[PDB]
Design a protein around this ligand. Sequence first.
Ligand SMILES: O=C(NCCN1CCOCC1)c1ccc(-c2c(CO)ccc3ccccc23)cc1
Ligand SMILES: N[C@@H](CCC(=O)N[C@@H](CS)C(=O)NCC(=O)O)C(=O)O
Ligand SMILES: N[C@@H](CCC(=O)N[C@@H](CS)C(=O)NCC(=O)O)C(=O)O
Ligand SMILES: [Mg+2]
Lengths: 197, 198
Amino acid sequence: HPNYKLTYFNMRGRAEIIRYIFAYLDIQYEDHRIEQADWPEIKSTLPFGKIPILEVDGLTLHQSLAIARYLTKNTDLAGNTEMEQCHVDAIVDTLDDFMSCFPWAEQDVKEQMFNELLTYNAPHLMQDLDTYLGGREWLIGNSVTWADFYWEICSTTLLVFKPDLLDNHPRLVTLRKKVQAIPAVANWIKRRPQTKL
Amino acid sequence: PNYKLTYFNMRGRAEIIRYIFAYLDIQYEDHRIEQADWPEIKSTLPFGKIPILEVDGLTLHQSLAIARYLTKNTDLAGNTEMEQCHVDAIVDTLDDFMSCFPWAEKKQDVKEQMFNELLTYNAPHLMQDLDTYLGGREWLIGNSVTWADFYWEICSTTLLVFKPDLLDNHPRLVTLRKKVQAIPAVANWIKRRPQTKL
Ligand SMILES: O=C(NCCN1CCOCC1)c1ccc(-c2c(CO)ccc3ccccc23)cc1
Ligand SMILES: N[C@@H](CCC(=O)N[C@@H](CS)C(=O)NCC(=O)O)C(=O)O
Ligand SMILES: N[C@@H](CCC(=O)N[C@@H](CS)C(=O)NCC(=O)O)C(=O)O
Ligand SMILES: [Mg+2]
């Protein structure tokens, strides 16, 4: 059981998937939340200059989904078979692709691009996700995976900007609530720092 | 298995899969779609995107998800779980950057401005970070080739089309490209594959 230090901004953002996994697996970690003012110094010490990073016994890992996958290796969150693991990885990247389209660090052009993505593109993605879910209980297989975690995390952020995101997708709302009801996840959701994003 | 890869007639996002099939000597159907058939075929895809890989009647999607699946339990995977994390991280860092480019932008002046900005400002920083990460070592992760090395060669090949001087101050990254290109199965694929710009 190694020493884990997670470094990110004071927000859910790209660190939250790692935080859900730690909560579910009951893994102790330091939730290091930096202020924007401390970032220049920290940024200059990192191999690839981006966060989140996870220090594992002092060894710096980067890329939130690479880290998430590493932490879920040989756990019940990974997918029950090699093929299920592929399906999990694919859903995660499909979600991450969409979230990465938003110009988070871009006013005017930023506001325009956000409205276009939320209004013209998000509903299409929600439909494809609902279709993929196909009336089943979880996105992949017969039990929860970190793809379901990431679905709940990404949709929570999208709902902040688009409250009607899932008005045509009650089954996707049901999946969100199912993830949110998992005791370890429910406990983290009620206890985590309250931030907008 | 009966593998059928569907993608455009481009290296693009399918090429990492094509390299892995070649290296592992796995037969597959390299199906390249017609541009006139794209509007029709798009509605059949699980998320409206390509590449997809069909495996015995089952459809898979997402190029790196597929690449990771195909390299599981092979010598192209990281040797340890932490190495596998390093491979995944390098691949996502490359993929993040390539995905920033407005490949489908119709407005030519906007496209050229964005390409130039990414290539002249952002790209050099990435090359610097990759070179320092590599150091004096033989491959990006561990002591043998991984699919992270493949993806480096694939992405840099395309970047060099738009910025030929990209690696002028990074001879170690050039050497890495040549090492990947010197692998027999990869070299054979490179000489036999369709010659496309992207
Ligand atoms: O141009 C690209 N894609 C769209 C093709 N259009 C579709 C509509 O009809 C006309 C053709 C494209 C795709 C992939 C890439 C790409 C390359 C190109 O060799 C290499 C690495 C990548 C890594 C990540 C993402 C894209 C890439 C560049 C451009
Ligand atoms: N795909 C990467 C993205 C990393 C990334 O761009 N992180 C942002 C924060 S959300 C960042 O480091 N921005 C500050 C900066 O680039 O200086 C991941 O998921 O870890
Ligand atoms: N992250 C995904 C991205 C897939 C993707 O956006 N593919 C492009 C072609 S390079 C596509 O299908 N776009 C055409 C469209 O959206 O109509 C992957 O690597 O598979
Ligand atoms: Mg990605």
